[PDB]
Amino acid sequence: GDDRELAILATAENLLEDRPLADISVDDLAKGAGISRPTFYFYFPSKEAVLLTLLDRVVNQADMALQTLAENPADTDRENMWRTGINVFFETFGSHKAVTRAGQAARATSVEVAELWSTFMQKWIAYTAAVIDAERDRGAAPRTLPAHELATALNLMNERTLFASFAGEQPSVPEARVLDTLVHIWVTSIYGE
Amino acid sequence: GDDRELAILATAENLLEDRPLADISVDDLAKGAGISRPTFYFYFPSKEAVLLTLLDRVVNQADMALQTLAENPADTDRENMWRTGINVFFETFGSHKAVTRAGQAARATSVEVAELWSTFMQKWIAYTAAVIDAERDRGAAPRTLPAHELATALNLMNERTLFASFAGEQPSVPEARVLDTLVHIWVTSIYGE
Ligand SMILES: O=C(CCc1ccoc1)N1CCCC1
Ligand SMILES: O=C(CCc1ccoc1)N1CCCC1
């Protein structure tokens, strides 16, 4: 049921810690979840569909966490308010680096992974632009760039920079410095004249 | 000679306008360059090596243009000095979008394409950090983030945002707004307290 399904998802997330989706067979997932290969196909149509569900859960987990923040404003200054929002992504994706890495690789080959990512990026950018506009309306931020274009560049910077950090790419910001680095660039570009 | 070699490179850059490297065969490049398939193999070991050379030429072209700028400072204010530097990348990669797109796709599968990209990204980030430090030493920019970490995030933002613009990704900044968008974020984050 949701038991064999969860077992399959947990197995795939464990195996993805060690090798790419290419080195993982349906037999590996089935054996890890303690079921046969034809039984696997009753829960998922392919190993690609397993990754899509894992990605969908992590993305939604990030999106729900940001919604919670939105509904429960922290009582602190502006720089800290941005930091707690960026942190949702740093901690949610940073707690699932194997899925994040595999999902990024699948954007190239999977229309559904590309559309899921694109849909949520559009939503986070529109939320970011809405916050910038509210700040501009209250006179706390200057009318500089179009808010939506500024939001789009800053969300793409975060996608790329967090991802480089979590993958240990050359070049990357160390993971223990990446939150501070991004918050500085967001605050200075949103509030700077 | 350099004639048959150039013909092969021009053919591959033309074909890459229309389809991915996967849909292009060695026979396609040979026929386009007016030579046989075994003759092709005398100039390049594979279609992947053709892409690597095209990428190497565009990268070096960008790097030499930035060096020229470095050696011949423009007589203008700071925001314009950053704009002319970012522009080197916007115009060089923007004039070769098919190669840029294919080269980005090959980073996943080619160690040599990944190393070429990584080597030049490290050089541009180190140059960027050196400029920020000079500005800090002369008292024109505040000592906020570590210069090299700030440089790394801004160069990764440019890589990702320019690339999204040139590929017409969803989401992306329109190509006619992307230079202005990036220059704002660089200037406010480098000079903002
Ligand atoms: O940091 C963000 C968004 C940060 C943020 C803060 C408020 O709204 C979005 N992203 C990383 C991957 C995709 C987007
Ligand atoms: O915009 C830049 C660099 C811009 C810049 C200006 C000065 O030094 C680097 N990049 C795009 C792809 C890789 C780096």
Coordinates of C-alpha atoms and ligand atoms in Angstrom, one line a residue:
Chain A
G1 CA 0.0 0.0 0.0
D2 CA 1.5 3.4 1.1
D3 CA 3.9 0.9 2.9
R4 CA 5.4 -0.7 -0.3
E5 CA 5.3 2.7 -2.0
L6 CA 7.2 4.4 0.8
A7 CA 9.7 1.5 0.8
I8 CA 10.3 2.0 -2.9
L9 CA 10.8 5.8 -2.4
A10 CA 13.1 5.3 0.6
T11 CA 15.2 2.7 -1.3
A12 CA 15.6 5.0 -4.4
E13 CA 16.6 8.0 -2.2
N14 CA 19.2 5.8 -0.4
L15 CA 20.6 4.4 -3.6
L16 CA 20.8 7.9 -5.2
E17 CA 23.2 8.9 -2.4
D18 CA 25.8 6.5 -4.0
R19 CA 25.2 6.5 -7.8
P20 CA 23.1 8.2 -10.5
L21 CA 19.7 7.0 -11.6
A22 CA 21.5 5.4 -14.7
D23 CA 23.3 3.0 -12.4
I24 CA 20.1 2.0 -10.5
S25 CA 17.8 -0.7 -12.0
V26 CA 14.2 -1.4 -11.4
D27 CA 15.5 -4.8 -9.9
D28 CA 17.6 -2.7 -7.4
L29 CA 14.5 -0.8 -6.2
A30 CA 12.3 -3.9 -6.0
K31 CA 15.0 -5.9 -4.1
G32 CA 15.5 -2.9 -1.8
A33 CA 11.8 -2.6 -1.1
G34 CA 11.4 -6.4 -0.6
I35 CA 9.0 -7.0 -3.6
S36 CA 9.4 -8.5 -7.1
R37 CA 10.0 -6.6 -10.3
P38 CA 6.5 -7.1 -11.6
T39 CA 5.1 -5.9 -8.2
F40 CA 7.2 -2.7 -8.5
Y41 CA 5.4 -1.9 -11.8
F42 CA 2.1 -2.0 -10.0
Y43 CA 3.2 1.1 -7.9
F44 CA 5.3 3.0 -10.5
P45 CA 5.6 2.8 -14.2
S46 CA 9.4 3.3 -14.2
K47 CA 12.5 4.3 -12.1
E48 CA 12.0 7.8 -13.7
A49 CA 8.6 8.0 -12.2
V50 CA 10.0 7.2 -8.8
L51 CA 12.4 10.1 -9.0
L52 CA 9.6 12.4 -10.1
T53 CA 7.6 11.5 -7.1
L54 CA 10.6 12.0 -4.8
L55 CA 11.2 15.5 -6.4
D56 CA 7.5 16.4 -6.2
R57 CA 7.5 15.7 -2.5
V58 CA 10.7 17.7 -1.7
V59 CA 9.4 20.7 -3.9
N60 CA 6.1 20.7 -2.2
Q61 CA 7.7 20.4 1.1
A62 CA 9.7 23.6 0.3
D63 CA 6.7 25.4 -1.1
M64 CA 4.5 24.5 2.0
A65 CA 7.3 25.7 4.4
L66 CA 7.5 29.0 2.5
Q67 CA 3.7 29.3 2.7
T68 CA 3.8 28.8 6.5
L69 CA 6.4 31.6 6.8
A70 CA 4.2 33.8 4.6
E71 CA 1.2 33.2 6.9
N72 CA 3.3 33.6 10.1
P73 CA 5.5 36.7 9.7
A74 CA 8.7 36.6 12.0
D75 CA 9.2 39.6 14.3
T76 CA 12.6 40.7 13.3
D77 CA 14.2 43.2 10.8
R78 CA 14.1 42.9 7.0
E79 CA 17.4 41.2 6.5
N80 CA 16.3 38.4 8.9
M81 CA 12.9 38.1 7.2
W82 CA 14.7 37.4 3.8
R83 CA 17.1 35.1 5.5
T84 CA 14.3 32.9 6.9
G85 CA 12.7 32.7 3.5
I86 CA 15.9 31.7 1.6
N87 CA 16.6 29.3 4.5
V88 CA 13.5 27.3 3.6
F89 CA 15.3 26.3 0.4
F90 CA 18.8 25.9 1.8
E91 CA 17.4 23.5 4.5
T92 CA 14.8 21.7 2.5
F93 CA 17.0 20.9 -0.6
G94 CA 20.1 20.7 1.6
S95 CA 18.4 17.9 3.5
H96 CA 17.8 16.0 0.3
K97 CA 20.9 16.5 -1.8
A98 CA 20.8 13.2 -3.6
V99 CA 17.3 13.8 -4.9
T100 CA 18.1 17.5 -5.7
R101 CA 21.2 16.4 -7.7
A102 CA 19.3 13.7 -9.6
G103 CA 16.3 15.9 -10.2
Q104 CA 18.6 18.6 -11.7
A105 CA 20.1 15.9 -14.0
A106 CA 16.6 14.8 -15.1
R107 CA 15.5 18.3 -16.1
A108 CA 17.4 17.6 -19.4
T109 CA 15.6 14.3 -20.2
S110 CA 12.3 14.6 -18.5
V111 CA 9.5 16.9 -19.7
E112 CA 7.6 16.2 -16.4
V113 CA 10.7 17.1 -14.2
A114 CA 11.3 20.2 -16.3
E115 CA 7.6 21.3 -16.0
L116 CA 7.4 20.6 -12.3
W117 CA 10.6 22.7 -11.7
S118 CA 9.4 25.5 -14.0
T119 CA 5.9 25.7 -12.4
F120 CA 7.3 26.1 -8.9
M121 CA 10.1 28.5 -10.0
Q122 CA 7.4 30.7 -11.5
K123 CA 5.4 30.6 -8.3
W124 CA 8.4 31.5 -6.0
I125 CA 9.5 34.3 -8.3
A126 CA 5.9 35.7 -8.4
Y127 CA 5.9 35.5 -4.5
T128 CA 9.2 37.2 -4.4
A129 CA 8.1 40.0 -6.7
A130 CA 4.9 40.5 -4.6
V131 CA 7.0 41.0 -1.5
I132 CA 9.3 43.5 -3.2
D133 CA 6.2 45.4 -4.5
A134 CA 4.7 45.5 -1.0
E135 CA 8.0 46.8 0.3
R136 CA 8.1 49.4 -2.4
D137 CA 4.4 50.4 -1.7
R138 CA 5.2 51.0 2.0
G139 CA 8.2 53.1 1.0
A140 CA 10.8 50.7 2.5
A141 CA 12.4 49.8 -0.9
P142 CA 13.3 52.1 -3.9
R143 CA 11.6 51.8 -7.3
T144 CA 14.7 50.6 -9.2
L145 CA 14.4 47.5 -11.6
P146 CA 11.0 46.0 -12.5
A147 CA 10.3 43.8 -9.4
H148 CA 9.5 40.7 -11.4
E149 CA 12.8 40.8 -13.4
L150 CA 14.8 41.5 -10.2
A151 CA 13.0 38.5 -8.6
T152 CA 13.6 36.3 -11.5
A153 CA 17.5 36.9 -11.5
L154 CA 17.7 36.5 -7.6
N155 CA 15.7 33.2 -7.7
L156 CA 17.9 31.9 -10.6
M157 CA 21.0 32.9 -8.6
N158 CA 19.8 31.0 -5.6
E159 CA 18.9 27.9 -7.7
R160 CA 22.4 27.8 -9.3
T161 CA 24.5 28.9 -6.2
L162 CA 22.7 26.6 -3.7
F163 CA 23.0 23.7 -6.2
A164 CA 26.8 24.3 -6.8
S165 CA 27.3 24.4 -2.9
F166 CA 25.4 21.2 -2.3
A167 CA 27.2 19.4 -5.1
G168 CA 30.6 20.7 -4.0
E169 CA 31.2 22.1 -7.5
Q170 CA 34.3 23.9 -8.6
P171 CA 33.6 26.8 -8.3
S172 CA 31.0 27.1 -5.4
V173 CA 30.5 29.0 -2.2
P174 CA 31.2 26.7 0.8
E175 CA 27.9 25.4 2.2
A176 CA 28.5 27.1 5.6
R177 CA 28.8 30.5 3.8
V178 CA 26.1 30.3 1.1
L179 CA 23.1 31.5 3.1
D180 CA 24.9 34.6 4.3
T181 CA 26.2 35.2 0.7
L182 CA 22.8 35.1 -0.8
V183 CA 21.0 37.1 1.8
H184 CA 23.5 40.0 1.3
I185 CA 23.0 40.0 -2.4
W186 CA 19.2 39.9 -2.0
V187 CA 19.1 42.7 0.6
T188 CA 21.4 45.1 -1.1
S189 CA 19.8 44.6 -4.5
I190 CA 16.2 44.9 -3.2
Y191 CA 16.9 47.9 -0.9
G192 CA 19.9 49.6 -2.5
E193 CA 19.2 52.8 -4.6
Chain B
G1 CA 44.2 22.1 -43.6
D2 CA 42.8 24.9 -41.4
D3 CA 40.3 25.1 -44.4
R4 CA 38.8 21.6 -43.9
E5 CA 39.0 22.1 -40.1
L6 CA 37.1 25.4 -40.3
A7 CA 34.5 23.9 -42.7
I8 CA 33.9 21.1 -40.1
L9 CA 33.5 23.7 -37.2
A10 CA 31.2 26.0 -39.3
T11 CA 29.1 23.0 -40.3
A12 CA 28.7 21.8 -36.7
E13 CA 27.8 25.3 -35.5
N14 CA 25.2 25.6 -38.3
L15 CA 23.6 22.2 -37.6
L16 CA 23.6 22.9 -33.8
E17 CA 21.2 25.8 -34.5
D18 CA 18.6 23.2 -35.5
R19 CA 19.1 20.1 -33.4
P20 CA 21.1 18.7 -30.5
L21 CA 24.5 17.1 -30.9
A22 CA 22.6 13.7 -30.5
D23 CA 20.8 14.3 -33.7
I24 CA 24.0 15.2 -35.6
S25 CA 26.1 12.3 -37.0
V26 CA 29.7 12.3 -38.1
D27 CA 28.4 11.7 -41.6
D28 CA 26.4 15.0 -41.4
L29 CA 29.5 17.0 -40.5
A30 CA 31.6 15.3 -43.1
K31 CA 28.9 15.8 -45.8
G32 CA 28.5 19.4 -44.7
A33 CA 32.3 20.1 -44.9
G34 CA 32.5 18.3 -48.3
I35 CA 34.9 15.5 -47.1
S36 CA 34.4 11.7 -46.4
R37 CA 33.8 10.2 -43.0
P38 CA 37.3 8.7 -42.7
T39 CA 38.7 12.1 -43.7
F40 CA 36.7 13.7 -40.8
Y41 CA 38.5 11.4 -38.4
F42 CA 41.8 12.8 -39.5
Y43 CA 40.8 16.2 -38.1
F44 CA 38.8 15.3 -35.1
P45 CA 38.4 12.1 -33.1
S46 CA 34.6 12.5 -32.7
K47 CA 31.6 14.9 -33.0
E48 CA 32.2 15.6 -29.2
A49 CA 35.6 16.8 -29.9
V50 CA 34.2 19.2 -32.5
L51 CA 31.9 20.7 -29.9
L52 CA 34.8 21.0 -27.5
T53 CA 36.8 23.0 -29.9
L54 CA 33.9 25.3 -30.8
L55 CA 33.4 25.8 -27.0
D56 CA 37.1 26.4 -26.4
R57 CA 37.1 29.1 -29.1
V58 CA 34.0 31.0 -27.8
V59 CA 35.3 30.8 -24.2
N60 CA 38.7 32.1 -25.2
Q61 CA 37.1 34.8 -27.2
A62 CA 35.2 36.0 -24.1
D63 CA 38.3 35.7 -21.9
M64 CA 40.5 37.7 -24.4
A65 CA 37.8 40.4 -24.7
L66 CA 37.7 40.8 -21.0
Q67 CA 41.5 41.0 -20.9
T68 CA 41.4 43.8 -23.5
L69 CA 38.9 45.7 -21.3
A70 CA 41.1 45.1 -18.2
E71 CA 44.1 46.5 -20.1
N72 CA 42.1 49.5 -21.5
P73 CA 40.0 51.0 -18.7
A74 CA 36.9 52.9 -20.0
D75 CA 36.5 56.5 -18.9
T76 CA 33.1 56.4 -17.3
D77 CA 31.6 55.8 -13.9
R78 CA 31.6 52.5 -11.9
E79 CA 28.2 51.2 -13.0
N80 CA 29.3 51.6 -16.6
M81 CA 32.6 49.9 -16.0
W82 CA 30.8 46.8 -14.6
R83 CA 28.3 47.0 -17.4
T84 CA 31.0 46.8 -20.1
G85 CA 32.5 43.8 -18.4
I86 CA 29.3 41.8 -18.1
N87 CA 28.5 42.8 -21.7
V88 CA 31.6 40.9 -22.9
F89 CA 29.7 37.7 -21.8
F90 CA 26.3 38.8 -22.9
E91 CA 27.6 39.6 -26.5
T92 CA 30.1 36.8 -26.8
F93 CA 27.9 33.9 -25.7
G94 CA 24.8 35.7 -27.1
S95 CA 26.4 35.7 -30.5
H96 CA 26.9 31.9 -30.2
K97 CA 23.8 30.6 -28.6
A98 CA 23.7 27.2 -30.3
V99 CA 27.3 26.4 -29.1
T100 CA 26.5 27.8 -25.6
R101 CA 23.4 25.6 -25.4
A102 CA 25.2 22.5 -26.5
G103 CA 28.2 23.2 -24.4
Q104 CA 26.0 23.5 -21.3
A105 CA 24.3 20.2 -22.2
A106 CA 27.8 18.5 -22.6
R107 CA 29.0 19.6 -19.1
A108 CA 27.0 16.6 -17.8
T109 CA 28.6 14.0 -20.0
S110 CA 32.0 15.4 -20.9
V111 CA 34.8 15.7 -18.4
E112 CA 36.8 17.9 -20.8
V113 CA 33.8 20.4 -21.3
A114 CA 33.2 20.4 -17.5
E115 CA 36.9 21.1 -16.8
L116 CA 37.2 23.8 -19.5
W117 CA 34.1 25.6 -18.0
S118 CA 35.3 25.2 -14.5
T119 CA 38.8 26.6 -15.3
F120 CA 37.5 29.7 -16.9
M121 CA 34.8 30.3 -14.2
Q122 CA 37.6 30.2 -11.6
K123 CA 39.6 32.7 -13.6
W124 CA 36.6 35.2 -14.0
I125 CA 35.7 34.9 -10.4
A126 CA 39.3 35.5 -9.3
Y127 CA 39.3 38.6 -11.6
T128 CA 36.0 39.8 -10.3
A129 CA 37.2 39.4 -6.6
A130 CA 40.5 41.3 -7.5
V131 CA 38.4 44.2 -8.9
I132 CA 36.2 44.2 -5.7
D133 CA 39.3 44.2 -3.5
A134 CA 40.9 47.1 -5.4
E135 CA 37.7 49.0 -5.0
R136 CA 37.7 48.2 -1.3
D137 CA 41.4 49.2 -0.9
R138 CA 40.6 52.6 -2.6
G139 CA 37.7 53.2 -0.2
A140 CA 35.1 53.1 -3.0
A141 CA 33.4 49.8 -1.8
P142 CA 32.5 48.7 1.8
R143 CA 34.1 45.7 3.5
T144 CA 30.9 43.5 3.6
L145 CA 31.1 39.8 2.4
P146 CA 34.4 38.1 1.6
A147 CA 35.1 39.4 -1.9
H148 CA 35.7 35.9 -3.4
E149 CA 32.5 34.5 -2.1
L150 CA 30.5 37.5 -3.3
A151 CA 32.3 37.2 -6.7
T152 CA 31.5 33.5 -6.9
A153 CA 27.7 34.0 -6.3
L154 CA 27.5 36.9 -8.9
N155 CA 29.4 35.0 -11.6
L156 CA 27.1 31.9 -11.0
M157 CA 24.0 34.2 -11.2
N158 CA 25.3 35.5 -14.5
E159 CA 26.0 32.0 -15.9
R160 CA 22.5 30.8 -15.0
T161 CA 20.5 34.0 -15.8
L162 CA 22.2 34.7 -19.2
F163 CA 21.8 31.1 -20.2
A164 CA 18.1 31.1 -19.2
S165 CA 17.6 34.3 -21.3
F166 CA 19.4 33.0 -24.3
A167 CA 17.6 29.6 -24.2
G168 CA 14.2 31.4 -23.7
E169 CA 13.6 29.3 -20.6
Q170 CA 10.5 29.6 -18.4
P171 CA 11.3 31.4 -16.2
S172 CA 13.9 33.9 -17.6
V173 CA 14.6 37.6 -17.9
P174 CA 13.9 38.8 -21.5
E175 CA 17.1 39.1 -23.4
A176 CA 16.7 42.9 -23.9
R177 CA 16.5 43.3 -20.1
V178 CA 19.0 40.9 -18.8
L179 CA 22.1 43.1 -19.0
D180 CA 20.5 45.9 -17.0
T181 CA 19.1 43.4 -14.5
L182 CA 22.5 41.9 -13.8
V183 CA 24.4 45.2 -13.7
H184 CA 21.9 46.5 -11.0
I185 CA 22.5 43.4 -8.8
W186 CA 26.3 43.6 -9.2
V187 CA 26.5 47.3 -8.4
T188 CA 24.2 47.3 -5.4
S189 CA 25.8 44.2 -3.9
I190 CA 29.4 45.3 -4.5
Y191 CA 28.8 48.9 -3.3
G192 CA 25.9 48.6 -0.9
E193 CA 26.6 48.7 2.9
Ligands
LIG1 O1 16.1 30.5 -2.8 C1 15.1 30.2 -3.6 C2 13.9 31.0 -3.3 C3 14.2 31.9 -2.1 C4 13.0 32.6 -1.8 C5 12.8 33.4 -0.7 C6 11.5 33.9 -0.8 O2 11.0 33.3 -2.0 C7 11.9 32.5 -2.6 N1 15.2 29.2 -4.5 C8 16.2 28.1 -4.6 C9 15.8 27.2 -5.6 C10 14.6 27.8 -6.2 C11 14.2 29.2 -5.6
LIG2 O1 29.0 37.5 -16.5 C1 30.0 36.7 -16.4 C2 31.2 37.3 -15.9 C3 31.0 38.8 -15.9 C4 32.2 39.4 -15.5 C5 32.4 40.7 -15.4 C6 33.7 40.9 -15.0 O2 34.2 39.6 -14.8 C7 33.3 38.6 -15.1 N1 29.8 35.3 -16.7 C8 28.8 34.7 -17.5 C9 29.2 33.3 -17.7 C10 30.4 33.1 -16.9 C11 30.8 34.4 -16.1

